[PDB]
């Protein structure tokens, strides 16, 4: 999971949301009468009503992420 | 999972949303009377009503992600 | 999970949200009559109503994250 | 989980939220009649109504985070 | 969990929130009739109504965090 | 959990919140009829109604934090 | 408009209404750029969402009503 | 408008209403740029959300009402 | 407008209302740029959310009402 | 407007109201830029949220009311 | 406006109201830039949140009321 | 306006109100830039939050009221 970025040197953005009665669920794990319930999160979870990302990563960025799960 | 980016050197964007009674579900794991319920997330989960990404990655960016699952 | 960023040298952004009766859930782990319930979070969880990220990572940034789970 | 950033040298941002009756839940672990309930958080959890991040990481930043879980 | 940052040398930001009857919950661990209930937090938990971060990390910053959990 | 920062050398920010009847909960551990209830916090927990961080980390900063939990 | 009633001597009732977003208008007189706008009411106007009349006029009742309008 | 009533001598009632967002208007007289706007009421106007009349007029009752309007 | 009543001699009632966001208007006279605006009320106006009348007029009652309007 | 009543001789009532955000207007006379605005009330105006009348007029009652308006 | 009553000889009542944010207006006369604004009241105006009248007029009662208005 | 009453001879009542943020207005006369503003009251005006009248007029009562207005 190696990540790299490099940069060498030598506009109206509008988002509009009009809502009412808005219900949002992200990662949901609903269960009844179980034995093992594991919720492993290691990435990027974004929840909301107006999830807006504007003009991100102007220069160099690295989001190197690694997750794992071992069961024996 | 090797990732790299390099950059060397030598407009109105409009999103409009009008809603009412909006229900959004992302990753859902619904169950009854189980034994093992595992939800492993290691990537990128975006939930919402207006999920807007504008003019992202202007320069160099790396989203190198790796996930795994071992069951024995 | 190695991450790196490098940068060498030698616009109105509008988000508007109008809501009422807004219910948002992020990571949810609902259960009844279980034995083991583990919620491991090691990434990035963003919850809200207006989750806005504008003009992030102007220079160099690294979000190298690693998660794990061992069960024996 | 090694992370690094380097930088060498030689605009109105508006977010507006109008709400009423807003209920937000982040990480939730609801259960009844269990034996072991563990909630391990080691990343970044942001909850609210207006979760806004503007012009972050102007220079060099590192958010290297590592989490673990051992069960035997 | 090694993190580093380096920097060498040789705009109105508006957030407005209008609310009423706002209930926010961050990390929640609700249970009944259990045996072991552990809530380990070692990252960064931000809760509120207006969670705003503006122009953070102008220079060099490191948020290297590590968490663990051993059960035998 | 090693962290470091280095820096070598040789704008109106407005947040406004108007609320009424606002209830905020941070880390919550509610239980009934248990045996062991442990709440270990070793990171950074911010609770409030207007949690605002403006222009933080102008120079060099390190928030290296480590947490642990051993159960035998 | 003569009215009379006479009376000489010698059971579950259920109404249930389940609604949401209900708009009711009774007598409406909407106009623009007029000269004379008269609304004469002399009878019986009942407005609502659940207008229920149960087991009315057990004995003797008289609702003798008279209205008039003269224009010269 | 003569009215009379006479009486000589010698059960569960349930109304249930469940609503939300209910707007009720009775007698309305809306106008713009007029000269004479008269609203004469002389009868019986009942407005509400649950306008319920149960077991009215057990004995003798008289609601003799008269209205008038003269314009010259 | 003569009214009379005479009487000579010789049960659970349930109303239940569950509401939220309820707006009720009775007699309304809205105008702009007029000359004469008269609102004459001489009958019976009942406004509310739960306008309930139960078991009224057990004996003898008279609601003889008269209204008038002269314009010359 | 003559009224009379005569009487000669020789049960759980439940009203329940559950509300929130309730706005009630009775007789309203709203105007702009007028010359004569007269509001004559001579009957019976009942305003509220729970306008309840239970078991009224057990014996003899008279509500003889008269109103008038002369304009020359 | 003659009224009379005569009477010759020879039960749980429950009202319950649960509210919050309740605004009630009775007789309202709102105007701007007028010449004559007269509000004549001579009947019976009842305003409130819980306007309850229980078991009124057990014997003999007379509410004979007369109003007038002369304009020349 | 003659009124008379005569009477010759030869039960739990519960009202409960639970409120918060309650605003009540009775007779209101609001104006701007007028010449003559007269408010004549000669009947019966009852304002409050819990306006309760229980078991009134056990014997003989007379509420004979007369009002007038002369304008020349």
Swiss-Prot record, chains A, B, C, D, E, F, G, H, I, J, K, L:
Residues 6-42 are annotated as: 4 X 11 AA tandem repeats of [EGS]-K-T-K-[EQ]-[GQ]-V-X(4). Sequence repeats lie at residues 17-31, 32-42. Changing residue 21 to K: In PARK1 and DLB; significant increase in binding to negatively charged phospholipid liposomes; increases oligomerization. One of its GO terms (cellular component) is perinuclear region of cytoplasm. Phosphorylated, predominantly on serine residues. Phosphorylation by CK1 appears to occur on residues distinct from the residue phosphorylated by other kinases. Hallmark lesions of neurodegenerative synucleinopathies contain alpha-synuclein that is modified by nitration of tyrosine residues and possibly by dityrosine cross-linking to generated stable oligomers. GO terms for molecular function: actin binding; alpha-tubulin binding; beta-tubulin binding; calcium ion binding; copper ion binding; cuprous ion binding; cysteine-type endopeptidase inhibitor activity; dynein complex binding. GO terms for biological process: adult locomotory behavior; amyloid fibril formation; behavioral response to cocaine; cellular response to copper ion; cellular response to epinephrine stimulus; cellular response to fibroblast growth factor stimulus; cellular response to oxidative stress; chemical synaptic transmission. The keyword Cytoplasm applies. Highly expressed in presynaptic terminals in the central nervous system. Expressed principally in brain. Its main location: cytoplasm. It comes from the Eukaryota. It is found in: Cytoplasm; Membrane; Nucleus; Synapse. Changing residue 25 to Q: In PARK1; no effect on protein structure; no effect on phosphorylation of the protein; no effect on membrane- and lipid-binding; increases oligomerization; increases fibril formation; increases secretion of the protein; impairs copper-binding. The modification Phosphoserine is found at residue 62. The 'non A-beta component of Alzheimer disease amyloid plaque' domain (NAC domain) is involved in fibrils formation. The middle hydrophobic region forms the core of the filaments. The C-terminus may regulate aggregation and determine the diameter of the filaments. It is linked to Genetic alterations of SNCA resulting in aberrant polymerization into fibrils, are associated with several neurodegenerative diseases (synucleinopathies). SNCA fibrillar aggregates represent the major non A-beta component of Alzheimer disease amyloid plaque, and a major component of Lewy body inclusions. They are also found within Lewy body (LB)-like intraneuronal inclusions, glial inclusions and axonal spheroids in neurodegeneration with brain iron accumulation type 1. Soluble monomer. Homotetramer. A dynamic intracellular population of tetramers and monomers coexists normally and the tetramer plays an essential role in maintaining homeostasis. Interacts with UCHL1. Interacts with phospholipase D and histones. Interacts (via N-terminus) with synphilin-1/SNCAIP; this interaction promotes formation of SNCA inclusions in the cytoplasm. Interacts with CALM1. Interacts with STXBP1; this interaction controls SNCA self-replicating aggregation. Interacts with SNARE components VAMP2 and SNAP25; these interactions allows SNARE complex assembly and integrity. Neuronal protein that plays several roles in synaptic activity such as regulation of synaptic vesicle trafficking and subsequent neurotransmitter release. Participates as a monomer in synaptic vesicle exocytosis by enhancing vesicle priming, fusion and dilation of exocytotic fusion pores. Mechanistically, acts by increasing local Ca(2+) release from microdomains which is essential for the enhancement of ATP-induced exocytosis. This is Alpha-synuclein.
